[PDB]
Design a protein around this ligand. Structure first.
Ligand SMILES: C[C@@H]1O[C@@H](O[C@@H]2[C@@H](O)[C@@H](O)[C@@H](CO)O[C@H]2O)[C@@H](O)[C@H](O)[C@@H]1O
Length: 553
């Protein structure tokens, strides 16, 4: 059967969600199916689809898709709409521990009828686990395999993913139907961010799913009790899900991309996508620019990831869920948040206990297999450092990915700059340094005879939103106050974003004739000064920006 969606490093997938309403036109946040697909740029459309989450249509609990007459009616109403407009769609059919979800035969029927139905999602179960979730998912995966569709499972936490793949039914189904399976993170619960990336990407490396990815959830900002950027001492509310810096959304995507991931999903959509059919700056100037990077520059392939891996951690003699300080001293000081401090080790893969040690040896013949009982873990950092050489100086995040450097400031909500000094692997320049403010990322690609540099620090001032009067408590999710915030967003944030405060990124090329650069960027959102020292052959460009800047040197 032909695959309904091609998903790989050369053809990544961007998911944008719509949510059901139990009234009106049947959709929340004032959006429509037509407006959703209208929001997706024409160059991105070949690599995109719309997620349909029944949300408020679900009864007795919103977002929990218990099979009902009304639920089916809603799926069918939306499928009819999407089919008429040739909009590729995925249905959320499992969530939050629900055991009585739509029958596999019902889904089979819908695949038969609707060419636009590309697959289904299972989302979020770590707080409400039961032993039916894995076998149910396995059955739906088999249905997906029948029709060339994809089953996408977003979930989180080390113990949880360990538990899922220990299920004999789901482990078997994964071995059979890996082509049709996507396993993905969902960093909502502000725990296990590093371990989850290692285990989920490890499933992909182990051949249990052909693609992995993420649901990047700005509700994490609410979970942390964070408010306006860098602010302390204010009570959280729904405005917190609209306050994670736009460029930081893209940095979360970069963690997936550079780990070989290929599927990107997002919450909360009132911030990350659209309200009243007006796409938001988080979407247009955060998610879209990074997704375009991923379309234009294929993520590391499975074999590239395998080949760069010097060690793996195998859960076979004790599990990563039992080593809560594992990533300390290596690359994450704080698993409650997604940003990595260090790119020296990439994402270290964690291999699941159901994969035999002989198979690991076969997949990664050149990697050390660490286990919990490895004597080398008595000096964990020194040992890993003997395998992964130090590649840069400074306190910023930098990762070497083939012929490129991937860089960001790792400070999530502390207003402090970071610096990196990056040795270079061609004689275009000897070394390249960056001074980065928070919520700035960069990508430097070394071509044979030029450097391509991408800078993006886009972050709107959230102050105006935080200054509004009213009750925006999260207990009014799915209620009129949430619409009120969404209505404000479509008339203020999305049309008159407060993005005129520029921040400075300083780029220095040491040991680089005075370059004649080609520079562009977001209209009216950057200025720059250049400096050339002909004796030292040092070129400095000082870029003041709020948004994207691109150069070829
Ligand atoms: C079960 C999930 O429900 C919704 O997500 C919830 C959010 O709306 C918010 O309350 C966060 C705070 O942690 O919790 C989530 O459960 C859906 O958006 C999601 O896709 C799941 O179906």
């Amino acid at each position: 059967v032909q695959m309904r969606t091609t998903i790989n490093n050369e053809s990544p997938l961007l998911l944008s969600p719509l949510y059901g309403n139990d009234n009106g036109n049947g959709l929340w946040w004032g959006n429509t199916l037509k407006g959703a697909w209208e929001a997706i740029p024409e160059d991105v459309k070949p690599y995109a689809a719309i997620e349909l989450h029944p949300a408020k249509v679900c009864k007795p609990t919103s977002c929990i898709p218990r099979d009902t007459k009304e639920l089916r009616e809603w799926y069918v109403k939306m499928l009819e709409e999407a089919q008429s407009l040739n909009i590729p769609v995925f249905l959320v059919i499992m969530s939050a521990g629900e055991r009585n979800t739509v029958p596999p035969e019902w889904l089979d029927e819908q695949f038969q009828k609707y060419s636009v139905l590309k697959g289904v999602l299972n989302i979020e179960n770590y707080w409400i686990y039961n032993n039916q979730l894995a076998p149910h998912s396995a059955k739906y995966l088999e249905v997906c395999a029948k029709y060339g569709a994809h089953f996408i499972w977003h979930d989180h936490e080390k113990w949880f993913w360990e538990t899922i793949m220990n299920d004999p039914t789901f482990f078997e189904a994964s071995q059979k139907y890996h082509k049709n399976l996507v396993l993905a993170t969902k960093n909502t619960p502000i725990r296990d961010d590093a371990g989850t990336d290692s285990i989920v990407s490890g499933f992909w490396l182990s051949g249990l799913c052909d693609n992995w990815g993420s649901s990047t959830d700005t509700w994490k900002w609410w979970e942390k009790h964070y408010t306006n950027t860098f602010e302390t001492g204010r009570a959280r509310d729904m405005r917190s899900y609209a306050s994670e810096p736009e460029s930081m959304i893209a940095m979360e995507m970069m963690n997936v991309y550079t780990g070989g991931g290929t599927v990107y999903n997002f919450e909360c959509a009132a911030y990350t996508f659209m309200t009243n059919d007006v796409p938001t700056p988080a979407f247009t100037k955060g998610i879209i620019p990074f997704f375009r990077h991923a379309i234009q520059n294929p993520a590391p392939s499975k074999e590239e990831v395998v080949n760069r891996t010097k060690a793996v951690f195998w859960n076979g003699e004790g599990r990563i869920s039992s080593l809560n300080g594992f990533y300390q001293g290596l690359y994450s000081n704080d698993e409650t948040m997604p940003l990595y401090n260090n790119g020296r080790y990439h994402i270290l893969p964690v291999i699941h206990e159901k994969i035999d040690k002989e198979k690991i040896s076969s997949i990664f013949p050149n990697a050390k297999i660490l286990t919990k009982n490895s004597e080398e873990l008595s000096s964990k950092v020194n040992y890993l450092n003997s395998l992964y050489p130090k590649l840069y100086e400074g306190d910023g995040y930098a990762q070497r990915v083939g012929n490129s450097w991937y860089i960001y400031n790792s400070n999530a909500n502390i207003n402090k700059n970071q610096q990196v000094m990056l040795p270079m692997y061609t004689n275009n320049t000897k070394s390249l340094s960056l001074d980065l403010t928070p919520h700035t990322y960069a990508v430097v690609k070394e071509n044979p005879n030029n450097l391509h540099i991408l800078l993006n620090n886009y972050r709107t001032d959230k102050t105006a939103m935080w200054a509004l009067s009213g009750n925006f408590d999260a207990s009014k999710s799915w209620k009129k106050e949430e619409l009120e915030l969404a209505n404000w967003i479509s008339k203020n944030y999305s049309i008159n974003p407060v993005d005129n405060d520029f921040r400075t990124t300083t780029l220095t090329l040491k040991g680089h004739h005075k370059p004649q650069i080609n520079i562009s960027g977001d209209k009216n959102h950057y200025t720059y000064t250049e400096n050339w020292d002909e004796n030292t052959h040092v070129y400095t460009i000082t870029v003041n920006h709020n948004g994207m800047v691109e150069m070829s040197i």
